Structures are given as C-alpha cells and as structure tokens.
Amino acid sequence: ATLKDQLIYNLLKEEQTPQNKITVVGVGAVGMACAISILMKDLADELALVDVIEDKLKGEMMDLQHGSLFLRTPKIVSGKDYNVTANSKLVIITAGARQQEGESRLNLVQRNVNIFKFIIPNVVKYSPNCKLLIVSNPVDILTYVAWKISGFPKNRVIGSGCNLDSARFRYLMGERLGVHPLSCHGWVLGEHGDSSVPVWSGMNVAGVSLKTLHPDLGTDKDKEQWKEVHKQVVESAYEVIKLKGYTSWAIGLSVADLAESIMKNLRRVHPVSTMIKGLYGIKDDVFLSVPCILGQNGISDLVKVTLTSEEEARLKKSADTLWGIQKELQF
Amino acid sequence: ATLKDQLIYNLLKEEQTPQNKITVVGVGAVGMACAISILMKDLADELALVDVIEDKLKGEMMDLQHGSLFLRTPKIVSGKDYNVTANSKLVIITAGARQQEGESRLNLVQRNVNIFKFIIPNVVKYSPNCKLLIVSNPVDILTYVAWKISGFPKNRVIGSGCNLDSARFRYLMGERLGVHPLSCHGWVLGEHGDSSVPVWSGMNVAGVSLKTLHPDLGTDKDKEQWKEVHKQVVESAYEVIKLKGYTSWAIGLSVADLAESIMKNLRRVHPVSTMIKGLYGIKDDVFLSVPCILGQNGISDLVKVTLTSEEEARLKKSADTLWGIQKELQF
Amino acid sequence: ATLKDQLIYNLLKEEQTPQNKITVVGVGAVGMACAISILMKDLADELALVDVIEDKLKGEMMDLQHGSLFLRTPKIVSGKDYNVTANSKLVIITAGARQQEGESRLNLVQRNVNIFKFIIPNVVKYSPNCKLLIVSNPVDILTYVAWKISGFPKNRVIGSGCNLDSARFRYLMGERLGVHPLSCHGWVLGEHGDSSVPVWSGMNVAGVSLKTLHPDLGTDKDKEQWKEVHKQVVESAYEVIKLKGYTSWAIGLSVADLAESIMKNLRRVHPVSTMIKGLYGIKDDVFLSVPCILGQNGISDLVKVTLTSEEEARLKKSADTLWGIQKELQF
Amino acid sequence: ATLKDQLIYNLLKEEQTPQNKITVVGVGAVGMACAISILMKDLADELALVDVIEDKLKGEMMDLQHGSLFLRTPKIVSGKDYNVTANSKLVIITAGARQQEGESRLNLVQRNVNIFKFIIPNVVKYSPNCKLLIVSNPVDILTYVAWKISGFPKNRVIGSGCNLDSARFRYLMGERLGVHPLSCHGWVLGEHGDSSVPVWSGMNVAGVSLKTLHPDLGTDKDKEQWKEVHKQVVESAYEVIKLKGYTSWAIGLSVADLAESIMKNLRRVHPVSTMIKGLYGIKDDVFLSVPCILGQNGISDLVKVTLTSEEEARLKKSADTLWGIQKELQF
C-alpha cells in the first residue's frame, strides 16, 4: 500500500466546500495587498485569485502557498477560469484599466465600462449569493456597472469609496494632535476624488467637537489651515504614485477592514459607496460614499449625516456629474 | 492659542526612546513584504525603513503610514540616513542584487559583499546592541560576511537560512498527505540553495517516523518518488521568479516568523543560518543552517541533529563548496 | 418619531442565521474558560451559553456582553431553552456532575447518560449539522454516549481525550530541555488518564528521536527518570485541583485550539477521542484518543501510530474495560 | 551523559532582563481575568503573579503554565514575595478589601490604605520605573493613595476608573441603535460609581451629535428616556454581582485594553483616573477620570472636555467629597 494510506486511515470524502471563501479579481499591486491582508487577519479559510495573465497568476499563488505554514488559511487557489471563484461569500474587484502618472479618477470610465461586462456576470454564476466589493476606480460609477449587470439588491454591491480617504484623514488629524488615528474621528464623504467633502462638524476627539472650539476651522479664513489636510488626502495617491508609480498597502489595509466587518457581522460603520437615491436630494440611481452599517449582508443601514447647505450642495453636484454619464451605458 | 492647545493638556514632556524597534534594510519586494508581515503581527513599536532609493523609500513609508489606522504600530520612519536606525532591537537586511531567472544565488556573492561593505558599518554604528537577521542572498555567505564586518558575537548574527526551505518542504509534504503543514514535520538543513540537505530521519507526522514506515524514503529506489519533493523545494525559487519575476510573500512571512521568536523570546527552534565550526567534521568558519534556538539574545543553543553518513557528507560538502567562495572573499 | 429612525435609514427588512455560531453547554469554571478562550480568538460571530442554574447563566452572559468593545463577536446570547443554540456549527459539552477535589473519572457514568439524554437531543433538535465536542469527564465513555444518543456518524462526536494531556506533556518536556513547547513534540494516547500511553518514540526535537538517543527513556531503567514526566502528565489535574480547587485555564485553551482547527478547517492533528473500532485489537464500540485530522467535519482521518509490544496492550486492555461499562449503560 | 547535553549545544547561559514584563497583584476573579486577557494578547514576554494565599497562587500559575503551549508568553512566575515583580514595566493592582450586597465603594478606604502600605512600597522597590495601574475600588481614592506611597509622578499612576463605565455605556448605546459598540461614541467621566457623568454632547454615531438631533437626550422630559442608560451603567456591576456573585470578564478586557495602549505606546485616548487638580475648579489633590492619552510613560496628555457647569458641578462635588475622605487617612 501507498505510504499515505499506510499512515492515515480514511473516513470521509466530500471535503471541498469552502465555508468562508473570499475572491480577489485582479492581482496587481492592490489585489495582492488586499490578498496578503485578508490572509493575515484570518478572515477567509479559502482564498481565490483571478486575473488574465497566467504566469503572474500562478506565481503569486505559488508564493502565498509557500507561506501556508505561517498562515491559518488552508487552501489558496488561482486561475483565469472563474470556476475557482465558486462559493465565495465575498468578491473583491480591483481589475481593469488602472491609473497613470498624472491621470485621475476620470480617464477610463469607458475603458472599465467594458472590461466589467465579462468579470461581473461570471462572479454571479459560481457565487450567486456572494457580496460584491468594488475597489477599482472610478469606483462610484463602477459600483453602478457592477450593480445593474449582476442584478443584486443594492445592499450587496458595495464600492470602497471614501473608506481610505477617511483613514488618511484620521492619520493626518492624529499627526497634528499627537493622538493615535484610532482616537481621531473624522469623516470624508461624497464621490471619492476632488469632490470628496470633509464633514468638519463631526471632527472630534474624545467627544469634543473641534469645529466648536475653532469655529473658523475648515473655512479658508482658518488660522491653522485645516482645509489643507483635506487636500493632502485628495492628493495622497498622486504624491505616492509620484514616489513609486502606485499605491498598494493602504488600500489593502482599508479593504481588509471592510471584509472584516462583512465576514464577522460586526455591524460597524464605514464610509463606502452605496446607492443614495433619495438621500441629500439626489433623485437619480447614483452611487457615492455615506456612513453605512456593514455586515454579513453588506449595507443594511445608512447614517443620515446632517450636512450643511454648502455640503449638501457639493454632493448633489457630483451626484449629477455622474448620472450625466450612466444614462449612456453600453452594457 | 491653538486648537491643539484648547483640546489637549500636556503633562509629560520628552521622549522617543524606542522600546521594541525593528529596522528593515532594503525596500524591494522582499523588504516591504517583511515590513508588512512584521507590521501585522505587532512585533515593533517603531519600524524604520532604510535604503538608497530616496523616492521609492519615501513613498513606501507613506503608503504604510496611511494605514496606521488599521495597524497597531504607532511610529514608522525612513530615510537614507542610518540615524533613523538607531536603538533597534532587530535589524533585518534584505538589500542587494536578487536572482534573475536561471541565475544561482551564489552568483550574487561578489555584487552583494560590496553592498554589505557599505551597509553593515552604518547599522552597527547606530544599533550595536542589536541582533542582525540576514535575508539577502547568498544568505549563508552574507551572514558570515556580516559577522566579520560587524564583530558581533556569533549569536547575534543570524541567517535567514533554510527556514523557508523547510517551510516549503512542509507545504509539499502536507499537500501529499492532505495535512496542514503545521502538523507535518521534517527539516531542510545546509545552505539556502541547490546543495540543501533534507533529513528524512526526522520526517514524521504525530511522531510517527516516515522512514521506518517506508524504508525506501528519499532514495532513488523510491516508487512514491519522495526525493522529488525536496527537488521541488530546491526549484521553488526559480519557478516563482520565472512566473512573476521575483519571490517576496513567502519569505516575508518566513522572516516575521524568525522575528516573532526573537522579539517575544519564545526559544522556538528554527533552522536559521549560524556558525558550525567544529561539528559534522567541519573546521573552517562556514555558516550553515542547523536547527537553532532563537530568542532575546539571538541564537543561544544548537540542536545536534543526528545525521546518517550521507546526510553528514552532503552537509560537509555543501559546507566545502561554501568555504571555497568564502576563502577567496576579499574585504 | 424615534431618534434611532432620525439617524438610521434601513434597507434590510429581515434576515439573520449565524454563519459561525458556537454554543457552550454549562457555565462552570471549565465552560467559562472555554468561552473566554473562544472569544478572544474570534472564532465565532455568535457565542451561545446554556445551563440550568439560570441566574449564574445570565450573569456570565452580561459579564461577557459588557466586554463587547474588546471582542469581535457581536452576538452573545444564553438561556435555559436550547432554542438559542440554533445554527451552531460547533457545540461544546461541559455538563454533568463534576468530580471534586480529587475523584478519578471511572466512578460516574450512571447519572451522566441520563442528563445527556435531555441535552444531546436538544442540541441536534436545533443545530443538526453541528459538531459535538465532548469535554465532560470521563471523556471516552461520555463521547460514546453523545454519539449513541444523537445518531451522528462517528466523524462528528469528538472527545477532548488526551489533548491537554499531550499539551501538558509538551510543557513538561520543554521545561526539562529548556525549549518552547512548540518545538517539543510528544503524544499521549488511550483512555484519558492513568491508562494513558506516553509513546516514547514520538518524543523528538527538530525531528531527532529523544528515544534513539538515550535509549532508556521512559523506562524504569532510567538514570534521568523520564518515565516520571508521564506520571506528572497524569497527576497534573490533581496537583492543580489540590491547590486552587478545580482546573480551568489550561482546559479552555485546549478546547479553543481544537475549536479553531474545526472552525477554520485547519486539518491539523490532535490527540482526541473518536471511535477506534477495527484497530489495535478493538472491535468493541469503544472510544479512545488517537491523532486525528480535525476539519470542518470533525475527525476526517486517523493517524495509525505504530505502537510497541507493551503499549498496544495497554490500549486495548482499557478498551475492553470501557466496553464492559458501555455494554450495560441503561438508555 | 544527560539527555540534554546530547540533544543541544549551548552558546549563551546568562541573560534575563525581560523586555515587556507585567505584574498583576491579586489573583481573585479580577486579577485572573486580567492575567488571562493579557496572556491572550501577547502583550508580555513575562507575567508575574503576587498574592497572600501561597497555595491558591501556585495553582493559578500552574494552570496557566500547563497552557504555555497555546500562548506566546514564555515565562509565568508566581510568588507571595514581591521579589518576583522584578523589572515589570506595567504593574496592575487588583488587591484590596472589596464589597458584598451592600458595602458602598466609599467608606473602607482605610483598611485598604493599610494593605496598599504593604504592596506599593514593595512594588516600587523591585520595579522603580514601572507604570502603576489601580483597578481596586474605590479606584479614584486608592489611586491617589498609590501615588502618595510611591512618590511616583502623576503620569505613572493610573486608575482603571471609568474605562469599563464607558465600555458598558457604549455597549448599551449599541443596544438602542443596533450598531457595534465600536461605532458608538460617548464618554462616562467623573468619579467611578454612582456619580459618574455622562457627557451627552459627546455621544455620536459616525460623527453626528445625537444631542443635536434629539435635544432632550439624557433629560427628564426625554420620551425615549436616555437617562436610564446611565442608570444601567452605574448599576450594571451590582446587577451582575447579584446573579453570579462577582464581576470579572469585562474588567480584564477593560484592563487588557489599557495595558495594550501603554505597553505598545499607542497614544490612544482612554477615560482613566488621573490628577485633575487645576481643571474644572478643583484645587485639591484628587484623581477622577477624564479622557487621558495613554503611552509608554503612562499618562502624557489630558483632553479638556467642554463640560457645562451642571456637568462641571458633579465633578466638583465629587472632588470635595473625595478630598473629604482623603484628608482623614492615617498614612
């Protein structure tokens, strides 16, 4: 007899059906960052990667697999057939025409418009119940594309929106005050880009409202000039791409914090793109970031933040700008 | 006044003094993979990145800093100036030429010895009390070189060694036997290269020796062809490098593992690379990976792994090829 | 016009069903030590407690509940009626009339079968696809009982067995040798306690047999008295209980280790009790502890440990006494 | 010819100074819950236990030690001699004369001051540079006591205080809103106990002030009756004591978290007790809770919460009664 069977008495069969599968679509720098972080937070027991390049795909898979000793994720699978997606509770989409030196969240749409039409319909054919987390830019419109195509009630199609923008914000806030970002609370909402809006009313430490102590905080009259930390956040990715062509780690850490909420029913509040049709005016079927309540069904709840009239404005604007495009969708 | 002064009341002044600082030298794929693993296991309170590529170094530091929120390591620094290395408990060196497709690791010795002639002085100058962990290849030869240039006790100069080769061995073992690599045991000693030695003696699950249950284990007269699983771990690097152009994920977890045993002082046993003079009939200063005991002081104890005669010859000459290069080494 | 509706706008009318529920039956010391171990390892998104003394049951629930901020398990629930153990993937039994400051585990089986005939059917009534971790003492006969009552296939009625016994054996080894228990390997088997086999072979570090080194190990012939560590691994329950009046922390860490292997599908090996009918001279319907591949379907494979002369005796001697007791059981 | 010397060659002998040691004083329910939460977060390389009951100690130490296989804390030491507290970085005081189903957390201050006159001097002797955490109740007064008997500066004497008063307040805030305690923000400050202060303006989700939406909030005419959340918090302890006899689980999780911010230099914001003389109109040496900033030197910074002289009264009246008792302690 073979050595395996000389050493190991069998007892069953099936053992394949993964119970917490997670799938990354795209294995550029972002997808791998997502992957390496989903893998070290012990979120998924199966991890499936999909992309079109088949050398880069096999090799990345091989490399993580070689570390399984140092992990608690016991199956890692790759391939350009979406059949390995099969039964993923959550699917992360990062793939498509991404970025330049200089180009910003407004030089693709039509590129990525079309790529998506293969990816999405196949994520639904082997993961028909799954949850859809859109990362690749222009992320608010691509959540539109992802939603209609797959069908899916709006709660199960989440875009990653301003989740990282509020993080980079809470980092610059903490660096200014000497407090850990965990203890600085600040929200950045809207469409992820230059038309994000930092809601300064909610900026606080230990409960105390910074806007209250510093009434001119945010207005271009500000002594301390905080409106610029919101400009560091808009141009962080520009000044990190300028130093090394791309961003990766931070999105991966932010994304894995989102998957954490979903995969564990934390019902924490994150700012992510979902369908605000109704809220803040907005009568169109548009997507953009708002304090959501993420769980094993994704966006079950929204936190109806009270905006000022100029804030509610800049939202509707961007919320037009967008639908001025999506009425024109080839899909 | 200032906002930060309406809000926070200072009470203690002074201090940076790093209590558990780690320093990674080199921010290539390997480096940033260690830095990312080491950041996610909460091994450092300060983490420093040093390299010669200014903009890439800066940009990688920023990418990580933008993730502080999802981390628990409160300070991350970088620069060209080893001054930011100062007072480190552990210094992880990864800089230097890495293997092209097909290239051996010993073919990088001369190019890297030059780079160590620069790097080690500056490291010692700022953290003479540290432990040195060598990742760059050829890792056994560069561990030795780092010993001569540092003049650190042999126990504080550790080689990355065959910790990853044994870990790749245990992945392949486990996949043959449908077992998690944690529960498969078996050690790869020697050099981190083509003359590594697999030790079937100690191959076992649940304490059950595999060479007695199958007395043709390893050897060519092997119909199950187990000697090819050690051939797969030798050809591991080449094939990843073939596929994606470099390895990074597995070794960064392999390194953070070593780091875990040193920072927390576990006295775990790893096959790091150390000085073996006067053992297995070797009498010159050749560093080789034997199972060691790592902790707060680095290596402190060598497990004497009882080898065959072939296992002991394999090792001696994997050692004697190693000394060949090492003797003619000029610095 | 509530304030919650003024802040939250819902989308998800309905839903729940927990995807990683764990129930613990009995909130004595052991159970609550299980519960806290399970909780800080974030293995479950819903922890359910059930006992019959309800007051102590609700107080422990609140004590955990209040620590919600520090756990990643959003739903902790308990009660008297098992309708809240519903949808457990894993259920852990600590019930029964507990031993007292020094009672052996073979004077008790009578009353226990009859509580189990209330509990075990209620567990399946609400969580039909769950796995039965039996912790109650004595583990081997009581696992047989749980199995015989639920009608579950043997792969789903796991006994704590000699797991913590091997854990303690490994802690005693490493403290002898001066090594972390992780780098010391050893395997105690059989009926849990006294009739426990210390398989002196498996005793290895870095794979090199402690026996074939000093071949009077685990013998009366031993200068270094090593047959005694086994004796301490049997008299440990005693010496703790004799001092603090029950054992808790070590057992809950052990249960959380198996739980993790089951809930995270790790397929690691552990010395646990399941049916061993057909091996070593057992074709009774006994339960003993052997190395077992634990996965999402409980035991999946047995590790056919090659046992010696004297030891294969001790395994079945016990096994037929057990069968004595178990052939009479009135249920 | 020892089994050890044959299996291991030794390079270093000496050693010791553990880098992140933690001493817990008092192995009651609270102490042991502290010790177990600190062990399952890997904050310490060494944990010491000190107490008075010689046997009950060795049992708790030996139970944990048998769990060494499931922890990354290589050393656990117990003893009634505080020479085992040697070189701690954090020292957690849980010991004292506590209460029943009556005794108010304010009147016994003197019996405890007596006990602290034994502990504190021995603690500060063998760890002159430790951080001192007081959990024992009346935690605010006994913190002031520990401060005097040590001569330590303000920043290294810290009282447990309202840390769990706020954990519980936020957990209940999650009850009403269906949000994880992590995304519910609010502070309970003042004197630990019945006269703590719920800062209602603070209270927010996602940054939106619940006090601005629901202007009654925490008032008497408030139809949702948000006043009884505070009442629930203030009485929670005693209600849990009724049911199970004592509290434990939530404190240890409370203390683990504090211990992490200090041991990892987070600079996170916590409501711990510190010297408040000079703010809100207090001119006596009294400690009560405000949001301090916890680091590697303990308390480095205070948050000056905008109270409103009703709130600010409560604090004053708390200081005055506090200094009342503090003035009549013989020590």
Residue numbers in the entry:
A (entry chain B), B (entry chain A), C (entry chain C), D (entry chain D): 1 to 331
Paper text:
Lactate dehydrogenase (LDH) is a tetrameric enzyme composed of four subunits. The 1,4-dihydronicotinamide adenine dinucleotide (NADH)-dependent enzyme LDHA mediates a redox reaction for the reduction of pyruvate to lactate at the end of glycolysis when the cytosolic NADH/nicotinamide adenine dinucleotide (NAD+) ratio is high, which is a crucial step for regenerating NAD+, and is needed to maintain glycolysis for the survival of cancer cells. Full-length LDHA is composed of 331 amino acids and includes a nucleotide binding region (residues 28–56).
We determined the human LDHA structure with malonate at a resolution of 2.9 Å, and malonate was derived from crystallization conditions. LDHA with malonate is a typical Rossmann-fold protein of mixed α/β secondary structures with a protruding N-terminal portion. This structure was solved in a new space group of monoclinic P21, and four malonate molecules were bound to each LDHA tetramer. According to our results, each monomer LDHA with malonate has one active catalytic substrate binding site. Two malonates are located in the active-site loop (residues 97–108) of the LDHA tetramer. LDHA with malonate in the substrate pocket has an active closed conformation. Oxygen atoms of malonate bind to the two charged residues (R105 and R168) and three polar amino acids (N137, H192, and T247) of LDHA. Interestingly, the structures of LDHA with malonate and NADH were shown with all active site loops in closed conformation, whereas when LDHA was associated with the inhibitor MA, the active site loops were in an open conformation.
